[PDB]
Amino acid sequence: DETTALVCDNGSGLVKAGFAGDDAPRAVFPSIVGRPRHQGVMVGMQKDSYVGDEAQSKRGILTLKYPIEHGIITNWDDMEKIWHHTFYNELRVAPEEHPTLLTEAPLNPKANREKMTQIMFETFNVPAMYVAIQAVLSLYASGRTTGIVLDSGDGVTHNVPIYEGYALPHAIMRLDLAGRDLTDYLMKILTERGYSFVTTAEREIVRDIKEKLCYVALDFENEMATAASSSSLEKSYELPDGQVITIGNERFRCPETLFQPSFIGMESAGIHETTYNSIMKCDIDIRKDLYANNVMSGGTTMYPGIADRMQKEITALAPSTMKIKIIAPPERKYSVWIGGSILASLSTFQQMWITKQEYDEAGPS
Amino acid sequence: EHPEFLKAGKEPGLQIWRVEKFDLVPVPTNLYGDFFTGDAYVILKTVQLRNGNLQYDLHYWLGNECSQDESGAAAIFTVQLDDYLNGRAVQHREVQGFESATFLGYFKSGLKYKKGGVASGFKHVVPNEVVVQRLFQVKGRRVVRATEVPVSWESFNNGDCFILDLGNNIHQWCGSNSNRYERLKATQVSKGIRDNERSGRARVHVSEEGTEPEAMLQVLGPKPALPAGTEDTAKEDAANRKLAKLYKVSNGAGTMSVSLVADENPFAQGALKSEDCFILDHGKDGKIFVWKGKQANTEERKAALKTASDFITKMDYPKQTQVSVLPEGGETPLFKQFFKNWRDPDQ
Numbered sequence: 222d223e224t225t226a227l228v229c230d231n232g233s234g235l236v237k238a239g240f241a242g243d244d245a246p247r248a249v250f251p252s253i254v255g256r257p258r259h260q261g262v263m264v265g266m267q268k269d270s271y272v273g274d275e276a277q278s279k280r281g282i283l284t285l286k287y288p289i290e291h292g293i294i295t296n297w298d299d300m301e302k303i304w305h306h307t308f309y310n311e312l313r314v315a316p317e318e319h320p321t322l323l324t325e326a327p328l329n330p331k332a333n334r335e336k337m338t339q340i341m342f343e344t345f346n347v348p349a350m351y352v353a354i355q356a357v358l359s360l361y362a363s364g365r366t367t368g369i370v371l372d373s374g375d376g377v378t379h380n381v382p383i384y385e386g387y388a389l390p391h392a393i394m395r396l397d398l399a400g401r402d403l404t405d406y407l408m409k410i411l412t413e414r415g416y417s418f419v420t421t422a423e424r425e426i427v428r429d430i431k432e433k434l435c436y437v438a439l440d441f442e443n444e445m446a447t448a449a450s451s452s453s454l455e456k457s458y459e460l461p462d463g464q465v466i467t468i469g470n471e472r473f474r475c476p477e478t479l480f481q482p483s484f485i486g487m488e489s490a491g492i493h494e495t496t497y498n499s500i501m502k503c504d505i506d507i508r509k510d511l512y513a514n515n516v517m518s519g520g521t522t523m524y525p526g527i528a529d530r531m532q533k534e535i536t537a538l539a540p541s542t543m544k545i546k547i548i549a550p551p552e553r554k555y556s557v558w559i560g561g562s563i564l565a566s567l568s569t570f571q572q573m574w575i576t577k578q579e580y581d582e583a584g585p586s
Numbered sequence: 587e588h589p590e591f592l593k594a595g596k597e598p599g600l601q602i603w604r605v606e607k608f609d610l611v612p613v614p615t616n617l618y619g620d621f622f623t624g625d626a627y628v629i630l631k632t633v634q635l636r637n638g639n640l641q642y643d644l645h646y647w648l649g650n651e652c653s654q655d656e657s658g659a660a661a662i663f664t665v666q667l668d669d670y671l672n673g674r675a676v677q678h679r680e681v682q683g684f685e686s687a688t689f690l691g692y693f694k695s696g697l698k699y700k701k702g703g704v705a706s707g708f709k710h711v712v713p714n715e716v717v718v719q720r721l722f723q724v725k726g727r728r729v730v731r732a733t734e735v736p737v738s739w740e741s742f743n744n745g746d747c748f749i750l751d752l753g754n755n756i757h758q759w760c761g762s763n764s765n766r767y768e769r770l771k772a773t774q775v776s777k778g779i780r781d782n783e784r785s786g787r788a789r790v791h792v793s794e795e796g797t798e799p800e801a802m803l804q805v806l807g808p809k810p811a812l813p814a815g816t817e818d819t820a821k822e823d824a825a826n827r828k829l830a831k832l833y834k835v836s837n838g839a840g841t842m843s844v845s846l847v848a849d850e851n852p853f854a855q856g857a858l859k860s861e862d863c864f865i866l867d868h869g870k871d872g873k874i875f876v877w878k879g880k881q882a883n884t885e886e887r888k889a890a891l892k893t894a895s896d897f898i899t900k901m902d903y904p905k906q907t908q909v910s911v912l913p914e915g916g917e918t919p920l921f922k923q924f925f926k927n928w929r930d931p932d933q
């Protein structure tokens with residue numbers, strides 16, 4: 222014909238879905254399943270779901286659940302229909318005709334991967350499939366086999382040292398602080414100013430404000446002082462129903478949380494500390510290359526200035542002569558997906574598919 | 587399995603591959619040292635160890651102009667090669683003009699950089715992009731059907747409905763003299779295009795005489811006086827009833843038969859059966875649909891596809907006729923419109 226592979230990258234906030242050999246995922250949609258809201262006592266056994274962007278469009282009459290929590294699938298029923306919607310609606314293909322590459326969170330439990338595989342073969346009838354670690358794909362995308370990745374999405378942030386192709390699992394670092402939190406914090410911070418951002422509708426406007434006018438301050442407390450001297454650093458923003466709101470130091474106080482998780486009351490080390498701590502859990506002999514290959518991934522690493530911050534912060538934490546590089550690829554919202562598109566297109570990857578037949582002969586594996 | 591992996595590296599020496607469109611291709615042997623700056627390469631060095639086994643070094647080289655797929659592939663090939671050598675090889679990332687001394691010492695004359703190289707393997711996409719500008723006449727007495735017409739005011743009349751589809755924005759427009767059934771269909775199909783064809787990533791704008799928005803006028807130009815129109819006759823209705831034919835491609839009975847299931851609209855949804863493929867020929871409008879049942883076998887699928895596209899020339903349909911292929915459950919509105927009471931499976 223001849224057959225094309227599907228690459229599908231399931232994340233807590235967004236599904237990135239498309240065909241192997243593309244630049245980019247063809248379809249990019251909210252990782253949500255929505256049912257029509259009901260109020261009070263219960264009577265019946267129900268009915269229909271809506272998935273993804275149609276759920277966004279229809280939210281005013283429905284309640285939205287998220288199948289993936291902190292990068293792990295926890296709701297299999299709803300994860301099934303997130304995949305159904307990907308196959309039949311967004312890519313609009315017969316899954317039975319295409320090998321399919323899927324991504325997983327680092328340290329994803331064996332049982333998760335096995336269910337994922339079960340569903341693909343037994344409910345979706347794919348001819349073959351493969352599961353790739355999210356972070357590892359991102360590293361490949363930048364053309365490295367050794368480095369340490371910071372992947373930070375809507376629901377989870379990870380630090381994954383990788384050497385000579387494969388992640389070092391004991392040095393992997395998971396922080397349950399990502400986009401949604403940052404978004405929630407900006408909602409909070411702006412409300413304390415005197416606006417009204419509470420409702421889940423408003424959570425969408427703030428996500429936009431967050432991703433359009435936030436940045437990471439090179440030096441936090443200096444920027445605080447600049448913000449208290451002039452209006453210089455202030456931006457204006459227009460709400461649909463509105464009307465214009467003014468935004469100030471919240472521009473940088475919001476992403477700051479990544480470096481100071483106490484902003485939202487978290488005991489945790491900051492992303493710079495978790496990076497350093499991750500490098501330090503690795504063989505001393507490979508640390509040098511880890512420091513010179515800090516690759517950034519995920520929508521939450523998109524903040525202007527974040528690279529220069531990682532640089533300043535890591536420099537400070539590391540040995541004085543250590544060569545430190547931060548790689549922040551322009552297209553890093555989709556690094557994981559691009560990694561998959563490249564791996565799935567390789568002549569040599571054909572050998573690596575778990576085929577349907579091979580499945581029907583062992584306990585997933 | 588893979589043939590290049592088999593060749594590598596079985597004895598002392600130097601091997602060099604260039605990444606080409608997702609593949610590892612060996613470099614012409616007296617060209618070792620010539621390196622295209624638009625390209626990416628993998629280099630294996632094999633040294634004989636006095637104890638009987640060999641030392642491997644894998645260097646993947648990346649030109650300043652190489653595309654992301656090539657550098658990505660170069661990297662991945664390196665790990666797959668190292669794995670095939672039981673992880674016993676040492677990986678080196680070599681950036682153009684910054685090559686390792688050990689790497690440089692593989693070439694007695696020194697590297698020679700070369701402008702150009704082989705075209706990237708990537709097809710290019712911009713996520714969620716849709717480029718569409720098309721217009722529909724929604725018309726009928728009791729059997730309303732949507733049919734495509736030129737994108738101009740000349741297609742318009744005050745007696746029918748029209749869907750002007752611009753991608754993220756869909757203009758549903760009904761004339762004042764449009765009957766009740768045409769209005770529901772306009773709405774049905776508009777919502778279909780938005781929620782189904784555009785995955786919800788589109789907005790529908792409803793309009794009529796004197797309310798039509800800037801963006802509608804922006805395409806169609808300044809609204810002239812629109813004609814008519816004649817009411818829908820029961821005779822015109824029976825025409826809509828014959829607009830499309832429905833075939834079944836199957837070999838379930840031992841041999842490949844393309845049977846005509848129905849030539850009269852609306853078809854029974856029940857007719858589309860999972861063990862087979864089906865073709866909904868609406869070729870006059872430039873649209874043939876190939877419905878693949880989830881249990882149809884692979885030969886049935888290739889036949890349906892072939893048959894469907896024979897129709898274009900056999901029936902002298904106006905190419906550019908579009909053959910869309912639909913998975914069971916992935917059906918589109920302009921194909922769902924020909925069915926009596928479509929029932930959405932999971933609801």
Ligand SMILES: Nc1ncnc2c1ncn2[C@@H]1O[C@H](COP(=O)(O)OP(=O)(O)OP(=O)(O)O)[C@@H](O)[C@H]1O
Binds near residue numbers: 234518
């Ligand atoms: N320019 C930007 N600035 C800040 N944040 C952004 C920007 N663009 C996208 N984001 C955030 O990135 C997140 C989505 O990124 P991504 O798709 O990598 O996460 P995910 O894979 O869905 O979730 P996870 O990786 O946590 O499971 C959203 O929270 C979004 O607000």
Ligand SMILES: [Ca+2]
Binds near residue numbers: 519
């Ligand atoms: Ca993710």
Ligand SMILES: [Ca+2]
Binds near residue numbers: 653703
């Ligand atoms: Ca090239």
Ligand SMILES: [Ca+2]
Binds near residue numbers: 385668674675676677
């Ligand atoms: Ca090795």
Ligand SMILES: [Ca+2]
Binds near residue numbers: 763764765
């Ligand atoms: Ca009419």
Ligand SMILES: [Ca+2]
Binds near residue numbers: 881886
């Ligand atoms: Ca059959």
